[PDB]
Every structure is written in C-alpha cells, then in structure tokens.
Amino acid sequence: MDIDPYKEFGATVELLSFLPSDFFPSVRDLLDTASALYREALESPEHCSPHHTALRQAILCWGELMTLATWVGNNDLVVNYVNTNMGLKIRQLLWFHISCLTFGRETVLEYLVSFGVWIRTPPAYRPPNAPILSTLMDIDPYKEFGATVELLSFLPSDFFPSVRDLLDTASALYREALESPEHCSPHHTALRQAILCWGELMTLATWVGNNLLVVNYVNTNMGLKIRQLLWFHISCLTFGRETVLEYLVSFGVWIRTPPAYRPPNAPILST
Amino acid sequence: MDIDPYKEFGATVELLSFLPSDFFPSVRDLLDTASALYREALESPEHCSPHHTALRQAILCWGELMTLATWVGNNLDLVVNYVNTNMGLKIRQLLWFHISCLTFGRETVLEYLVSFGVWIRTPPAYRPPNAPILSTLMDIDPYKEFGATVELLSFLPSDFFPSVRDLLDTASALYREALESPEHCSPHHTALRQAILCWGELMTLATWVGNVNYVNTNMGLKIRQLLWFHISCLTFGRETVLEYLVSFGVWIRTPPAYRPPNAPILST
Amino acid sequence: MDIDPYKEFGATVELLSFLPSDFFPSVRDLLDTASALYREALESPEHCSPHHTALRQAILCWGELMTLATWVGNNLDLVVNYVNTNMGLKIRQLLWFHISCLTFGRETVLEYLVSFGVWIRTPPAYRPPNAPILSTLMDIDPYKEFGATVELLSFLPSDFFPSVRDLLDTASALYREALESPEHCSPHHTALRQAILCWGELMTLATWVGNVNYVNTNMGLKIRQLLWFHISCLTFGRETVLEYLVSFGVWIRTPPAYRPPNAPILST
Q1: Interface list for chain A against chain B, based on CB atoms closer than 8 Å
Q2: Do residues C34 and C99 lie in contact, with contact meaning Cβ atoms separated by under 8 Å?
Q3: What are the residues whose beta carbons fall under 8 Å from the beta carbon of B10, sequence distance 6 or more?
Q4: Which terminus of chain A is less hemmed in, N or C, by CB atoms within 10 Å?
C-alpha cells in the first residue's frame, strides 16, 4: 500500500527531495527546537493543529528507531546506516513540521520552491545569498485521543491481532481515505505515520540480519507498540472514538473478575 | 501510582515534614480525642465532611495494623519498635492532621504548619521557647456512610472479588488522573485514596516480617472488599451496586437446585 | 553603580542589619521551605509576584556559587568557611526575605524588621527572653516567565555575547535612574538587579580564590546571557527579542554554503 506522509499537507515527497541532502539540520537540534518552542504544546492533551499530531509520531518513531539500533549496536555499522537513509527521512519530516508551525504552512511551501530554483541557477545569475526562511520530553502517542499508554496495557498483551492482518484491515477499508490528500480526522493523520513508522522499522530489521534473531526482538518490544497503535486508530475509525475508550474499560475489568462471576462472552466490538 | 494522602485537603506529605518525628502524640491519645469529641460523628451514616470520610479509614487501618502486629508477636518485641518507628508514625501524622482539621478548621492547620515551619527553622538563640500551638477553634463501619454495612457485604463469597493486584491496577488504569488530583471529586475518591495507602502499610510490614503469607487470607479480604466496592461505586454508581448487593443476597442464600446456576452480573 | 537589592521592595540593606548574622536559617533549611510551599509557582511560567522574580534568581545565584565552591575544592575546605561568611550570609538574607514576604505578606515583614529592632536595641535586663517571631498572615528556568527557555538561548554561540564589563557599562549608561529607583517598572528590571548583584558576588569570590580564569567560560557565560536578554528586552521590547531568537535558530542550524553570511541583526 502506497502512503505519502506530506501529501495531506500540500507538499509531496518529491518536493522535499528538491532541496539538497545536506541542507536539513542534523537530528539533535531539530528535537531541541521542538523541545524549546512548543514542548508544552506537544505534550498537551490537545491536537490543536494537524502538524502537531504528525509531530508526536515522528518524534516517537525516532525514539522507536534508535532503541533498535543500539540493541544491534551491542550485538558497528548499524548506527552509521540510520543516518544514511533511515534518519534522513526523519530529518526531513521534523524540519518540515517545525517550519510549518513556526512560519506557517503556505510560506514554507513557497520556500521549498524558491530555495530549489536558487540552488539550481548558475552562481553569477542568481541572488547572492540564499532566500532564508526567517520572518523578521515524553509524549504519550494517543494522549490527545483521550486514552493513555497505561489504558492500552490494561488489555492483555496477547489480545491485539498481528501487524500482518492489522494492515490488511486498513488496506481493505481505509485505503482511499489514507491515500487522499485530505486529513478528514485526527485518527487518519496519526495512522498515516503509524504505517510508515512500521515500514521504516521493517526495512532496518531486514537489513541488520541481511548484512551481519532480530525479528524476535522487534516483535516483542516495538511490534507490541505498533500492534496497539494500529488497533486503537482502526477501531476508532470504525466504531467511533467514544466506544473504544469504554471498550478498554469494559474488556479490562472483564478479565480481572473471576470466571464464575462474569458474563461468559467477551464484550467484543460490533455495530 | 503514587497518591498523596493530604493532597485533596491542601497540604503535602513534604509540608508535614516541617514538624519533627516526635511532635505528634501517641496513638492512644489521638484515638481518645476522637472518642471524646467526634465519636457520634464517625458512627452516623452520613459523610458529613471529607475529613470524616478519611478519618474512618485512618482508624480502621490502625485496627488492622495492630491485629497484624499482635499475630506476629507470638508466632515468630522486635515488631513493635518497628511499627512505632515508621508504620505507626504515618498513622500518627494522619490522625493528628484530621482531628486538628476537624476541631480548629482546615484553614487554621494549613497556617499552623507554616507557623511551625518558621519556629523550628530559626536557630535556638533567637527562637522563643513557646512552641506554636493551636487554641483558636469504638467501632466504625467503613462504608455505612455510603449505605451498605459490613454484614450486608459478607454474603459475597471470598472468591467473588478479584485479586488485590488486579484491583490496584484497575483503579490505576481507569482513574489515576482523579486519584492524584488535588480535589475530592467524590466521597468514594476520598475513601479510595486511604484504602490504597492502607494496603501499602500492610505490604511494607509483611515484606519486612519475612526478613507466613496469611495476610491475603483475612486482612487481604477487607482491602479487596473495599477496593471492589469503591471502584464499583464509581464505575456503575452507588445505587446500582447497592441494589446489586441485595440481589446477590437472595441468590447466595437459597440452596442449590433452587437458584439459577449463574450468579447475577453487575452492569449498566 | 551601587545597586540595591531590597530598595525596590521597601526595605534597605542597612535596615536588614537590625537582625544579627546568626538569625537567618541555613541555605539548606531555606530552600527546603521554598520547594515545600512554592514549587508549582516558582517553576511556573508566570510573573505571579515581584517576590517570585527576585526569588527565582536568588536560588540560581546560590546554585551557581556553590558550583564554584565545589570546583575550587579540587584544583588548588578553606573556602567553605569563606563562602559561608561573606557570601552565604549575604544570600541567606535574600532568601529569608522573599520567602517570608511571600508567606506573611510584604508589609508584615517591614513591620517585623522594625519590631526586631526594638527587641535587639533594649538592654538584656529589660527585653523579653522570647524573640518577636512572626507567625500570622528543584530546578528553575530563569527565562521561563519571560517567554524564552535556556535551550532557546543555547543556539546563540559563545562569541556572540559581549563581555561582562561591556554589558555592565551598557546597563549603567542606559538604565541607571530606573534600576536604582525604588519602583519595579517592569519584570525585567527586577530580574536585572539580581543578575548584576550575583556578578558582584562571583567576582568577589574569584578575587579571594586568587589570594580561575574559567569563570568567564563556565559561569560568566550564564551571566552574559542573562545580562544580554534583559537589556535587549528593555531596549527593543520583549516580543521583538523573542521573535529574533527563533530567527537566529533557523540561521545557526543551517550549514554553511546555504545560509546568508550576515547574521539577522536586531533592529527597531
């Protein structure tokens, strides 16, 4: 399934490859820019802008990535490879949303074009200096959706279906909605990054075993966090948001009771 | 989950560290003050103030810490100087704070801990020898204020309740934003805060007693009866579990081959 | 420029010499009082009182002085008695004043410093043995109440701020009738009186230690940031310098051969 992380905002991935490779800041201060500007707005229980919902995943997908690289770092060429192709996508994804929140969306969309033609003209027949952009931290991944990380661990660990058929439910119902250039929901824009976070995670896992069992390690630490992040958004896109949140309460306290004093069927989601 | 016992009243457990460890009276002198001033208020079926709702679970927790200390005192002197060093020192802070808020009002005590906070902080050459003091102005059913009695809830069998770790993780998953919030929001929310900290005292002791696990057989039931009740009064309402306990009462009392084979189910 | 820390708040420096040296509680016992009562308001990003702005810088002045005293303990016990006599005692007054002015109000402390005057002036055969004590009504971001953070000002490089003598001469030439006045007139002036006086204590300690040129690259840089930010907040306004700080952020983060070679100068 094709999915584009910038296409709902107005740019494409092709427009973000227009600028050169070594233009975007190295990803140490792009996190430190968001930590210094609106750390209190990313950690808020609101999703007040669609750049904020996409930024809370791209930060956590970088955190979900480096723990995999350090684990195969202990068992180096495996951290040196992330900055080649795996972290260059995150450097673009963090720069585009920080600049969207600071300087507006339509200003930076015309900046990507104006810097691109500036670096491509000959030196003597261009403006002498580049047209600069200036106008002159723990994150719960679904705190803004009401639930908490503890509430999704209230359910048993071997309850959520596998990633192989969770994406198949996304690829059978929400394909035209996820590939559309509109947001249409805060659940959709959190689900577009949730597939690419698993997609960029899978290309690293089938690289470190290919060149140098990492499939066991990714499917018990990082596979469990993707299995519930996909399941929470698919179920909110199907049965509504304020039916799944009462379902974790209902299915939570159902399994805590003794079996002779609970109704015998689990309260499964249906309409 | 880490809850503060005084947070909903306007003081912190670090703010009561202004007072020294031996400023508080003995536990008998604090119980006799409540028995002389507020005996009839802690029996009556009305939670007339949120200090009364928390003073009952501070007394009944001491009623379980002393039956535990008496039981290990013969089935091995070394337990009573440990209970009255940190297990009973927290109860003395809890008993002193709620009685002094009941007589002198809450707002006077919140300025008294600060007025003591400048007396003990000044050096002895420049502080008055008159320490600051306040002069301005028994059985307890743990949920008779909520409607049900303890013998009304004894009809439920011992295996009806979930385990104590399953009930701590139920309140922590459902409402930890309300149990750590600095307001009351319910009398069940007041009583559930000290019901969890009472289990902390029973487990900090029983771990140290091991350095044998009958505490879950008799003392773990009364926490599980209280943890299930106050959770179900917030998940379903007060009257929905109050009319459930009557309807379980006629089911458990009839002999077999005259009852439905499935127990009644609390929902909606 | 002879600036005064208490003259804005009503008292003077010599009026606080009514109290003796060994009356103030220790710097350990004063910071435990501040964090117990005012931690949700001292770390808050608001301007809640001018006592809070003076207290936010008084803790970080001691937090920078104790780093220097710990640093000189290695690269040479003989400095702890110095930093408790001259500094210490000078910062125990500023911590005692703003904690007691926050708690008991500002006008009660000014009638208390007079009332300890009459108790200390009388001969000992006629004064009461009790002191007339008053009882009736953690990390801090020094920029957070103004809008900026510490890490927002880490983007500016170390060769960007002028030297301390060039930045103190800018103060006494531009703002001297407003700094020496007994009015606040801004939250920036109150935060600027403490940054100048904290540099007076750092250069006093650094002189006696040399009786050490790292002060202006580990601790003087923090003074060079604080003196630059508050002078620019008064000269160009507060919103303009906070808007310029995000425009230096997108400049200093872009690599060379992609940024304009001229830095985005502060204007207006």
Answers
A1: 150-151, 153-154, 249, 252-253, 256-258, 260-263
A2: yes
A3: B106, B110, B182
A4: C
- Name the percent of chain B in helix, strand, coil, to the closest 5: 55, 0, 45
Q: Please indicate the experimental technique that yielded this structure.
A: cryo-EM
Q: Retrieve residue C238's tokens.
A: 């507060």
- DSSP string over B7-46: TTTT--TTGGGSS-TTSS--HHHHHHHHHHHSTTTTTSSS
Taking CB atoms and an 8 Å limit, are B162 and A258 in contact across chains?
yes
Q: What is the CA radius of gyration of chain B?
A: 21
Got the DSSP string for C24-81?
SPPHHHHHHHHHHHSSTTTSSSS---HHHHHHHHHHHHHHHHHHHHHHTTT---TTHH
The answer to whether residues B210 and B82 touch, using CB atoms and an 8 Å cutoff, is no
The DSSP annotation for B149-180 comes to: -TTTSTTS-TTSSPPHHHHHHHHHHH-STTTS
Query: Which among B160, B167, B172 is the nearest to A150, CB-wise?
Result: B172
* Alpha carbon distance A187, A17 (integer Å): 27
CA A203-A205-A208 angle, to 5 degrees, is 105
Burial call B52-87: b when 16+ CB within 10 Å, e when fewer: bbbbbbbbbbbebbeebbeebeeeeeebeeebeeeb
Q: Which of B93, B73, B72 is nearest to B27 (CA)?
A: B93
* Distance (Å, whole) CA C119 – CA C258: 71
The nearest CA of chain B is from the CA of C115 a distance in Å of 14
Is the distance from CB of C23 to CB of C16 less than 8 angstroms? no
Which residues of A fall below an 8 Å CB-CB distance to C? 20, 22-23, 25, 29-30, 32-33, 35-37, 99, 102, 129-130, 132-136
Residues A77, A94: contact at Cβ < 8 Å?
A: no
How far is it, in rounded angstroms, from Cα B135 to Cα B118?
18
All residues at 6 or more sequence positions from B163 whose CB lies less than 8 Å from its CB, including other chains: B224
Structure tokens that stand for C236 in this block = 């160009």
The single-letter code of the amino acid at B13 is V
- Closest by Cα among A83, A29, A109, A87 to C250: A29
User: Count of A–B CB contacts within 8 Å?
Assistant: 34
For chain C, state the CA radius of gyration. 21
Resolution (A): 3.6
Question: Which is nearest to B182 in space by CA: B5, B8, B21, B6?
Answer: B8
Give the helix/strand (H/E) hosting C261.
none
Residue C144, judged by CB atoms within 10 A of its CB (0-12, 13-18, 19+), counts as: middle
* Distance in angstroms between the alpha carbons of the first and the last residue of chain B: 28
Contacts of C155 in chain A (CB under 8 A): 29
Residue from B249, B227, B64, B43 nearest B154 by CA: B249
Q: Give me Rg for the CA atoms of chain A.
A: 21
The partner residue sitting opposite C259, judged by closest CB among A22, A32, A130, is A130
Distance, in Å, from the CA atom of C120 to the CA atom of C19, rounded to the nearest integer, reads 8
DSSP helix, strand, coil percent of chain C (3-state; round to 5): 55, 0, 45
Instruction: Give the neighbours of chain B: at least 3 Cβ pairs within 8 Å.
Output: A, C
Distance from chain centroid for Cα C45: 17
Residue B20 has a CB neighbour count (10 Å cut-off) of: 9
Torsion sign, CA atoms A93, A95, A98, A100 = negative
Q: Tell me the C-alpha to C-alpha distance, in Å, between residue C110 and each of B44, C12, C113, C134.
A: 50, 10, 5, 11
Partner-chain contact B265 A262, CB within 8 Å: yes
Hey, what's the torsion of the CAs at B31, B34, B35, B36, to 10 degrees?
120
Angle between helices A163-172 and A186-211 (to 10 degrees): 140
DSSP tag of A26 = P
- The two structure tokens encoding residue B243: 């009319």
